[PDB]
């Protein structure tokens, strides 16, 4: 059944699971035509598929060519998402395949269920949480690789950097969700907080700055305040 506040530590047990967020799969800009009508122009998108225990992110980049000549794109986007997730699972060795896939939007349930009929022992679950994974395109390196892509491409990341060397998965996920909630509520503020101090750098192989333990507590403290102020 649904994942919610109450069954939250289940994310960090030893059953392999993946979150799937489809928010950023189909992305458009809306503009005026010469005749004064409105049209859309698609831009590259991505499926955000995340192991919350390990931090492994399977970022399938959705190139705008996949929409060429297609109708009802918002509906197609959900089925394309489910096709790509199913292909990902099939590409993994059996012992690496997830036992559960949690979709962040309920409209992904039927598309994913139908695509995973071959995998009856993989539970497809919704969630009651309002998770902030849409803000993943506010992470500069992720946005950069999506916009530069010239063809369909899968890019692998660890969205926790090296945090698991020092903190537990539960704490890592809480930090991630806090950073993303902040970036979603006020991206400019949030980003100022993270890069204010020029002496703290982002390693080439990382997404976030190399904060010490103490600096992370400071960072996490203004971000929780940026969120309170906006609300």
């Amino acid at each position: 059944g649904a994942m919610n506040s109450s069954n939250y530590a289940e994310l960090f047990n030893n059953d392999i699971k993946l979150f799937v967020d489809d928010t950023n799969v189909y992305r458009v800009t809306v503009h005026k035509t010469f005749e004064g009508n409105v049209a859309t122009k698609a831009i590259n998108g991505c499926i955000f598929t995340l192991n919350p225990k390990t931090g492994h992110l399977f970022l399938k980049i959705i190139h705008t060519s996949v929409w060429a000549g297609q109708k009802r794109l918002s509906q197609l986007a959900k089925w394309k998402t489910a096709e790509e997730v199913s292909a990902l699972v099939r590409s993994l060795p059996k012992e690496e395949q997830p036992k559960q896939i949690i979709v962040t939007r309920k409209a992904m349930l039927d598309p994913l269920e139908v695509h995973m009929l071959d995998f009856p022992n993989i539970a497809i679950r919704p969630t009651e949480l309002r998770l902030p994974f849409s803000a993943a395109m506010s992470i500069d390196k992720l946005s950069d690789v999506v916009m530069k892509a010239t063809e369909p491409q899968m890019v692998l990341f660890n969205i926790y950097d090296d945090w698991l060397d020092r903190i537990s998965s539960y704490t890592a996920f809480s930090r991630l969700t806090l950073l993303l909630r902040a970036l979603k509520t006020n991206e400019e503020s949030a980003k100022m907080i993270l890069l204010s101090d020029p002496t703290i750098t982002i390693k080439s192989y990382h997404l976030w700055p190399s904060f010490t333990d103490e600096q992370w507590i400071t960072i996490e403290s203004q971000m929780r305040d940026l969120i309170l102020t906006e609300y």
Partner: protein
């Protein structure tokens, strides 16, 4: 015109015969039902006065044998039996008719309701849904579960309706996942019609039998099956024009016959609103939409 005699009526019971029904008092001199129209299947159900909750009954076709009812005090119900001695049967019936102890199947001449509800229903197909091969007639009650219900527990007492499941490998061709789920025409026309049912008459016959079971016995699994078979057609973009026109007629007479106050526990809001207003066939069921809007506008 055929007859189903009753040995006796030892317990107070409401007896139905197709869409008709009458009350019989405890030990009333009732000895059965005459003038039953030949050419159609029929159903004779029972509702004990002391047990309102349960209805049990028998599907039969008088062309297939001489049938009678006899109460069994051990099992506590009216049982259908076959009389193999044709002369013993003619004699029993004639005696009961002579003493005028039988009700007459009360068909108005203008009235085509029963034909319209049973147009495609055949005894031989009923007997494959209700498996009890030593009898020519078939027992059904309010509590019998369907094979698909059991999958989700006695197999001998099950309703073996054709399993329909929209999120199943049978329904969804590899590589046409989205196409087959949003347009079920390949599941309807190839898997079910060409493959399983063979023709639309058999499909419609099972659909009609499910409704009748659903209305007459208040059988929940049968109601699920009726709606599933409607939804499969309405969710198909490509349906033969003759099937759509016949479906509209079929459903029209089912909705017409449904008791107005037994409708809220039987009609599935989602299926009907989808079928009449969202589906590919939203514009193809004119008679059914008009009677639904005038008789159950609340549901919609």
């Amino acid at each position: 015109m055929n007859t189903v005699p009753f040995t006796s009526a030892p317990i107070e019971v409401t007896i139905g015969i197709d869409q008709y029904s009458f009350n019989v008092k405890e030990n009333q001199p009732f000895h059965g039902i005459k003038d039953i129209p030949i050419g159609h299947v029929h159903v004779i159900h029972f509702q004990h006065a002391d047990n309102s909750s349960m209805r049990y009954g028998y599907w039969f076709d008088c062309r297939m044998g001489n049938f009678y009812i006899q109460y069994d005090p051990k099992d506590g119900l009216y049982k259908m039996m076959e009389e193999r001695d044709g002369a013993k049967f003619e004699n029993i019936v004639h005696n009961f008719k002579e003493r005028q102890m039988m009700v007459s199947y009360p068909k108005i001449d203008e009235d085509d309701t029963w034909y319209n509800l049973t147009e495609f229903v055949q005894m031989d197909k009923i007997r494959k849904i209700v498996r009890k091969d030593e009898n020519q007639f078939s027992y059904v009650d309010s509590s019998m579960t369907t094979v698909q219900e059991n999958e989700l527990s006695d197999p001998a007492h099950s309703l073996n309706y054709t399993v329909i499941n929209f999120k199943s490998r049978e329904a969804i061709r590899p590589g046409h996942e989205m196409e087959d789920f949003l347009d079920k025409s390949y599941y309807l026309n190839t898997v079910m019609l060409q493959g399983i049912f063979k023709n639309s008459s058999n499909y419609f016959g099972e659909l009609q039998f499910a409704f009748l079971n659903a209305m007459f016995f208040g059988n929940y699994g049968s109601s699920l099956q009726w709606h599933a078979m409607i939804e499969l057609i309405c969710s198909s973009a490509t349906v033969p024009k003759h099937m759509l026109d016949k479906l509209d007629e079929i459903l029209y007479y089912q909705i017409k016959t449904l008791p107005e106050q037994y409708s809220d526990i039987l009609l599935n809001e989602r299926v009907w609103n989808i079928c009449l207003y969202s589906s590919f066939q939203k514009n193809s069921l004119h008679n059914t939409e008009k009677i639904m809007e005038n008789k159950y506008p609340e549901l919609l």
